[PDB]
Design a protein around this ligand. Sequence first.
Ligand SMILES: CCCCCCCCCCCCCCCCCC(=O)OC[C@H](COP(=O)([O-])OCC(O)COP(=O)([O-])OC[C@@H](COC(=O)CCCCCCCCCCCCCCCCC)OC(=O)CCCCCCCCCCCCCCCCC)OC(=O)CCCCCCCCCCCCCCCCC
Ligand SMILES: CCCCCCCCCCCCCCCCCC(=O)OC[C@H](COP(=O)([O-])OCC(O)COP(=O)([O-])OC[C@@H](COC(=O)CCCCCCCCCCCCCCCCC)OC(=O)CCCCCCCCCCCCCCCCC)OC(=O)CCCCCCCCCCCCCCCCC
Ligand SMILES: CCCCCCCCCCCCCCCCCC(=O)OC[C@H](COP(=O)([O-])OCC(O)COP(=O)([O-])OC[C@@H](COC(=O)CCCCCCCCCCCCCCCCC)OC(=O)CCCCCCCCCCCCCCCCC)OC(=O)CCCCCCCCCCCCCCCCC
Ligand SMILES: CCCCCCCCCCCCCCCCCC(=O)OC[C@H](COP(=O)([O-])OCC[N+](C)(C)C)OC(=O)CCCCCCCCCCCCCCCCC
Ligand SMILES: CCCCCCCCCCCCCCCCCC(=O)OC[C@H](COP(=O)([O-])OCC[N+](C)(C)C)OC(=O)CCCCCCCCCCCCCCCCC
Ligand SMILES: CCCCCCCCCCCCCCCC(=O)OC[C@H](COP(=O)(O)O)OC(=O)CCCCCCCCCCCCCCC
Lengths: 96, 26, 168, 62, 54, 72, 713, 98, 115, 62, 97
Amino acid sequence: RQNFAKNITTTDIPKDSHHFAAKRSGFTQTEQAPFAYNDVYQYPKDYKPWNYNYKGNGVLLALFLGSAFSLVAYERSYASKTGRYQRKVQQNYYQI
Amino acid sequence: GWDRPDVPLSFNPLYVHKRELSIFDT
Amino acid sequence: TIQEMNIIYLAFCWGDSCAILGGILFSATHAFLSALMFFLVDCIYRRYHTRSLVEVNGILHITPNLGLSILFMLVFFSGIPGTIKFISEFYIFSGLLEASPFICFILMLVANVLGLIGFSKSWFNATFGMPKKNTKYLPMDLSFKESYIILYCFFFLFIFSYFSSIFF
Amino acid sequence: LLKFDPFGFYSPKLLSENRPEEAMPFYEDYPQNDSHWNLWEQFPEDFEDSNAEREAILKSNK
Amino acid sequence: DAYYHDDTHEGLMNEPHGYLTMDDPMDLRPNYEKSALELLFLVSGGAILALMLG
Amino acid sequence: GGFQKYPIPRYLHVGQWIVNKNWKWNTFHMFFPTAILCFMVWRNSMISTAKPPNYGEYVDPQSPVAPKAIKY
Amino acid sequence: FNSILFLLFFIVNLYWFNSGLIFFNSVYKIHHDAWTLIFQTDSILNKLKIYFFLLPLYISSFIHSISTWYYNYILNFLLFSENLNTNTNFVDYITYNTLLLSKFEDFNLFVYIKTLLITFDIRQINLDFLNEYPIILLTGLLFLFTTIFSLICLSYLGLYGVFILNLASILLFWLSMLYYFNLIVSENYYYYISLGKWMYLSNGFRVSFDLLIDLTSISFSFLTLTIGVFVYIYTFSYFRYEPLVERLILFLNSFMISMILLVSSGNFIVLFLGWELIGLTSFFLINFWSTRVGTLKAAFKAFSFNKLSDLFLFFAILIIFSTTYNLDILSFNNQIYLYESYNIDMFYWSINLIEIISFFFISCAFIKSAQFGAHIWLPDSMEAPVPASALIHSATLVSAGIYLLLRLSPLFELSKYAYFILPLIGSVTAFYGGLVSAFQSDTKKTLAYSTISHCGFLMVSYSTGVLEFVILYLYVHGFFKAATFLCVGNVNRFNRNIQDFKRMGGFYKYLPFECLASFVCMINLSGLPLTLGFYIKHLLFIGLVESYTLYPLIFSSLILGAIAGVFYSYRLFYSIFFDTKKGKKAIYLQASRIILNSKFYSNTSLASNLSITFLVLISYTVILYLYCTTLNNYYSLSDLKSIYINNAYSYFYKPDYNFLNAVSILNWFVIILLISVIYLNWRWSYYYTKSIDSLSKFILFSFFFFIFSKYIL
Amino acid sequence: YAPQKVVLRNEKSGYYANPDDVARRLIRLISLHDKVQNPSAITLKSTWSEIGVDPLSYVEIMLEAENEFYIELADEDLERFRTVEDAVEFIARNFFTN
Amino acid sequence: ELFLNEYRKRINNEVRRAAILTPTSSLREKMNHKIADQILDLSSPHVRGAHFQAVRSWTDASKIVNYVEEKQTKINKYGLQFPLLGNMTEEQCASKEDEVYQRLLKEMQKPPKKA
Amino acid sequence: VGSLSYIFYNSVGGKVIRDRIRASRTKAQKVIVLALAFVANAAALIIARNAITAHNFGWQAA
Amino acid sequence: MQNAYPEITDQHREFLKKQGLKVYEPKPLPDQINPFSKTYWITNAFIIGVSFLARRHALKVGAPRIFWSGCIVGVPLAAIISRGKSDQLDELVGARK
Ligand SMILES: CCCCCCCCCCCCCCCCCC(=O)OC[C@H](COP(=O)([O-])OCC(O)COP(=O)([O-])OC[C@@H](COC(=O)CCCCCCCCCCCCCCCCC)OC(=O)CCCCCCCCCCCCCCCCC)OC(=O)CCCCCCCCCCCCCCCCC
Ligand SMILES: CCCCCCCCCCCCCCCCCC(=O)OC[C@H](COP(=O)([O-])OCC(O)COP(=O)([O-])OC[C@@H](COC(=O)CCCCCCCCCCCCCCCCC)OC(=O)CCCCCCCCCCCCCCCCC)OC(=O)CCCCCCCCCCCCCCCCC
Ligand SMILES: CCCCCCCCCCCCCCCCCC(=O)OC[C@H](COP(=O)([O-])OCC(O)COP(=O)([O-])OC[C@@H](COC(=O)CCCCCCCCCCCCCCCCC)OC(=O)CCCCCCCCCCCCCCCCC)OC(=O)CCCCCCCCCCCCCCCCC
Ligand SMILES: CCCCCCCCCCCCCCCCCC(=O)OC[C@H](COP(=O)([O-])OCC[N+](C)(C)C)OC(=O)CCCCCCCCCCCCCCCCC
Ligand SMILES: CCCCCCCCCCCCCCCCCC(=O)OC[C@H](COP(=O)([O-])OCC[N+](C)(C)C)OC(=O)CCCCCCCCCCCCCCCCC
Ligand SMILES: CCCCCCCCCCCCCCCC(=O)OC[C@H](COP(=O)(O)O)OC(=O)CCCCCCCCCCCCCCC
């Protein structure tokens, strides 16, 4: 089964220690002993489980930069194929 | 008017097999 | 897999003619499609502890993503235009029509009607229905790994049709 | 199905996955996703991990 | 209709809910399958854009 | 008219009686960008659009636009 | 650090820069090449004066030089290409470009800003531009992407969000289609658009994704979209309070867009794609009730038939491609006559190429149009919700064969098999469907069999060979079938999903709007005298050909099918609304409670009523427009791209006494059948004797009225 | 709107319809019959034979009860019914849409 | 083989252009010309559209290769194959430019062909 | 380098854990985490594109 | 390539011109449709800026933004496709190369 360590040190696990409280007085001779650990996971507010909850611009920036590079590279390649240092834009372009 | 209880689970009655599923009827 | 492999092999029965291009494209599309289908079967077997139609039913209503993957896998297997599967079918059947039109008709009829219906019956019956049995043990859904594997298979099957036509 | 909620978003999830019962050992619940594509444990850069207890005890012993 | 119940008062009208996938939002495992597949997708797209498009 | 409403599990991502509070802004942010995408597609495609001559126009057979047969 | 101060300084700098630009432009116009003599004069005083008075120009030039240097460096880094034109050092390059001011020779800040602002002005768009470049593609893409993204993001778009988004998209699409409908139908406007090179289909072939917006395409597209708009508006009420309304709405939108793509297909590949898409989406609509496996059986039946049709269509396309190395629809239409003389060597028979291709096309068309033998799936397809059933059965799923025949008419004009098969099968289907619908007891089944009969009539009309008559029949049938389907859907929803009218009775008061709407829709649909739907059958009988070997059977079946409409219309209308109360007591009691009496009281939806009313009005208007375009003395329809003339219009313009009296036979048959369904008593009643007396009164009064009208005046 | 917290099925009371109204309507239907003589003597604990419903009249009364209540009763359930109490209990607990 | 298929594709495209530009009236009258004859002459026996193999004798293959070589020679006369259907160095390109310039000058100076 | 950096930076845990770790992450650390993988992959792809693109040809004229 | 339709005379052309007919002539792409146009690039820049602003607003209000991202990414892609289509020597129905 899983053998990884739960207690990570990269960050502190979010938790709430007030939802569950351990009894510490008024016990009976038939009642079981209480539980030592009673912390529950607490999700950050505004977290929506039904979507990626992604708020970064890295992917969009990477895709846009790739598209811009593709455009400029195609321009240079077309110039090279035409045997010119740069595109020679015509005065009029027709449908085709 | 009446406060009806939630939709019954009997709306989808579980089917219990009582006959062999012959391979010839695959 | 047997059907697709036999079609691919038939594509190589004319020496080094143009049938080799269709054979290669069909080999690629069959590889990806078989990977997709076997991965879907793997997910079904791993989350529902069975890969039999009698024991598995109504996958869609408990694992909507898995049911959607099954339905789109069936659509791709049907050979819809816009897919390398359709392109390979077009190559092979276009050649076979001139090679032996009646044989081409028989092959197309059988494979794309009778075999397609047999294939779709089981998958539709599994995907649809009502999973009333063993409610305590039902799974949740596909994971990110499985979802992205399925999406990549679909993306390749769709976009490889834009590969350079010089070699095809 | 209504009760089923392995994650703690809707029904609170204990950090201790389960409540151990008497006459049974305390084992973690099997996770919903059992993928084994896990790296070795990651630690913060320049993490301090010197054996401070051993060093202090050795210093006291002299 | 005769006895329609408003959404604000109907206790069985559902707001968007559910988990998108089976992955645990709060998982301590350094799992990398999702990262590997995302990298595969991104590199494939970048190769198409920078080597094939145009 | 419709069937009686029944509870749906929270964990399950399904569309049974799903209503979104922010649907107005969701529609706003899903409509206009789609319109821009389709405007881009339309203007790209118009470059390869063909139309027959107008009411008062005739095609000169010797003009370049007139169809030309293959020359062996 | 004040915003007001920053804005004031920026405005002052803008004014100073504009003045400097104007001054420099004038000085350059006067000193085309000699301007440097004064600008860069060696005098320190003059140099300082120029720099101070053109500081905004100099700083702008410096910024431009820095930006150009950095951009050139970026390009060189990315492309491993050349240098910055030359290998000039940074200092030399920047100094030279900053000192050079000729870059501003033709630049004016105010003019540039005005150009930028007017670039987005919406006053410039003109009807000339719209005619030159169609926005139908733009609006169709809007609808398609709206549907796709709404399907993907269901959580973001709740019920209301999905409804509003798709409503806006579909309304824009329908308005654009309406604008272009007038031009395409009458002004002879058609477009051939291409999106790109879709796929490679041979060693050096590559088929482009092209769309053809012609009269044939638009006739189906506008009808489907107009019906779909109101079906969409009606669905939100029919599926009211249902767990899955967004799913049904999105399925309907998907099917609509699939059919639009099929009809407006530029080549056989796109046509096949649309065929498969409509098949799959119809399967989904039929199997909407995914939980039940009984519905899955009907869905699988329809799927099997659709796959058989796909096989036939694919084989026909393969034959066409093998014969002609082209998949363009226009090229095939204009080339098929050359290859008409060719034959194909099959297993042991030399089959005619045209005959085999037309055989496969007609087989697929019959399968998808639910002709006799292949119609078995249509009655089972009624398991779908009423909006989906109306959409599939009105103009979307069951008209695919008609569209195929109309689009590839030049092929079938030279087809012996088509000539023999279309009339016989059409007439047999017409008779069968009409009689089965007349004897039917369920509303949806009755409408399905009526649809089968109308498909048979459409096939017979196409055999007659008047594409205008075929289009008119298609439009009338689609509009009124959709309206009747919506009405019966409201009736069924009121009756609690019981579609049989044996449990329906006295619903006229509980559904007042439905009663009158159904009356109008049914009198129009079922060919009845003095109704908009009489002319379609009149033209069909005008154009019916008589050289068929099986003409006796064909004509008898046509007559029986035509008369069968009256029985089913009367039964449906009377039993649903004005018959004795046969339904369960609860249906009436739950609605008859006095507490419900209010200004808001209704058993249906106001939106549903408005949608039905608007659909009926628009259908009337469009049918009148088509009738004026075609049947008027001045023929104003656009070119049909067909060279086959049937001479059928001769009997519509100058009919002879023989035909004029022959039509009277059918007219009087219908009259007698109406009298039968009205005055015939099947159950004892207090009004038996008085009904017989009323019949006698009517007979005698009709005789005397005719006498006075004709002779005594 | 349903709360984000987990909510379970709430079986308020086994009756999906007002049992008192169901019983009163059934008793009125029974009294409508010709064989029935004294409506007052009819009670939920009164057997069909003692109230005067013959075995053959019982099926007619049950068919009309099905028509009145908008449901269909299986022959097994009708035979299992032994008193008006059982009949009204089954009808009230029956989900009209199954 | 690809070039013959390209001829067929080009004639099909020209037929599509004719259909779109010209109304159905007179369309067949104008098509009953060079265009229809070429369409028929580019049928399957002469061009391998989608068939697996073009059944050609060795003589037919030699003729097709000779036709391709004739087209190549015509192109190379004016050196139109530098970026497409060819690769050359800078010196080769300059020499070819000079050769083509001289050839064009000589052709222009040549007098018109009689009859 | 890009692949390994991306894996190690985006394979620390679940969505919530990764988001919190990146929030606690310093400005420069976030910048490197976002930019290293992209820059490495982009440089590799650009170097690949350069070879096929023969821009350094001396015939560029006219 | 050679003329396929039968030839007509210049006198016949003059007669048609006097009758009032016009010779069909393909028209250049308008500034909006032309991909090598300052108007086209101004439109692209405006689209990019508005898309960035609307994406920020959608992120703030918790609304989908992948569509604005798609617009931003596809503006260069649409430009690439349009420019390639214009550059290709493919003669669809229109002006001959
Ligand atoms: C019919 C079948 C239909 C089936 C389909 C049905 C519909 C399905 C719908 C649902 C599924 C699909 C849609 C949703 C997908 C999820 C989207 C999402 O957002 O999810 C969040 C998902 C999870 O988020 P997360 O948990 O936060 O994880 C974050 C990622 O790990 C990491 O994110 P990050 O924020 O850390 O950013 C990392 C980014 C990092 O980004 C950056 O670094 C960019 C910014 C820096 C620019 C460089 C500046 C350098 C100078 C310094 C300047 C100063 C600093 C500036 C930076 C400041 C910081 C912003 O790195 C990269 O992306 C690396 C890529 C590099 C290679 C490619 C691009 C470059 C090409 C070449 C470029 C050449 C030119 C440039 C040259 C450069 C110089 C050498 O994140 C992502 O979006 C990740 C991307 C991949 C997601 C999955 C993709 C699946 C797609 C499926 C497609 C299926 C197609 C099927 C078609 C079928 C047709 C028939
Ligand atoms: C190193 C070797 C590799 C090693 C291995 C590598 C492995 C890595 C993994 C990945 C694989 C890599 C393989 C290599 C890939 C090579 C790629 C490449 O070279 O790229 C450059 C390749 C060619 O570039 P190029 O030739 O160098 O560029 C210069 C040319 O000048 C450019 O100009 P162009 O004219 O040539 O433009 C080409 C393109 C230009 O693109 C555009 O202009 C974009 C057009 C977008 C149109 C969007 C809507 C279209 C549909 C609606 C139409 C009707 C609307 C309403 C009409 C109303 C009228 C009344 O135009 C087209 O192709 C037009 C086709 C439009 C139709 C597309 C969709 C058809 C349906 C497909 C169905 C398949 C899935 C069925 C699912 C069934 C359910 C399960 O370009 C592309 O990649 C083009 C991609 C276009 C994508 C279109 C978007 C798809 C939309 C799907 C919608 C389906 C909806 C759902 C269906 C029904 C469901 C029930
Ligand atoms: C849970 C999934 C289960 C899957 C497994 C099951 C599979 C089978 C069953 C499937 C059905 C069930 C699942 C569906 C429901 C999923 C529920 C869910 O997760 O909901 C949340 C899911 C994510 O929403 P969220 O969590 O609120 O937001 C996510 C982050 O905020 C977003 O952050 P961001 O805004 O920063 O976005 C990051 C990045 C998104 O990151 C990615 O997706 C990474 C993509 C890497 C490349 C992989 C190849 C992609 C191939 C094309 C398809 C594009 C991806 C879109 C999805 C597929 C199409 C449906 O966004 C972009 O920048 C988008 C542009 C992507 C284009 C990249 C092009 C690469 C080259 C491709 C070949 C050459 C093309 C030439 C074209 C020529 C010009 C026409 O809901 C959505 O938003 C659904 C989006 C659906 C796609 C439409 C939007 C993107 C449109 C892109 C442009 C194309 C349109 C027309 C273009 C016209 C001009 C060019
Ligand atoms: C670049 C140009 C544009 C690029 C865009 C490319 C788009 C490619 C296609 C995307 C398809 C997305 C499908 C999303 C489905 C989401 C789930 C759903 O709807 O509910 C499933 C429903 C119920 O789902 P559910 O409610 O249980 O769950 C929803 C939420 N999830 C799935 C995340 C849990 O299940 C079913 O019964 C299956 C129904 C499947 C119906 C599919 C219909 C598709 C029709 C598309 C028509 C397009 C026409 C194209 C015409 C032009 C062609 C050239
Ligand atoms: C012999 C002369 C040459 C012509 C040959 C043909 C002879 C006429 C054949 C007519 C067949 C009509 C079949 C209709 C079936 C309708 C079934 C239906 O919906 O249910 C019944 C519905 C009534 O439905 P209902 O719902 O009100 O009640 C049904 C009640 N049960 C079930 C008990 C029957 O309509 C009728 O009852 C009308 C049909 C019966 C009366 C038929 C009269 C025929 C008169 C013929 C006149 C001919 C004029 C001369 C010229 C003819 C040739 C040009
Ligand atoms: C008769 C049709 C009725 C139905 C119309 C429904 C609406 C259709 C969409 C509008 C028209 C689009 C085509 C324009 C053609 C054109 O360029 O026509 C040309 C004119 C300019 O005139 P000229 O080019 O002839 O000089 O273009 C413009 O003026 C462009 C300005 C913008 C026009 C609207 C753009 C809509 C796309 C989405 C914009 C989103 C903005 C930001 C939102 C946050």
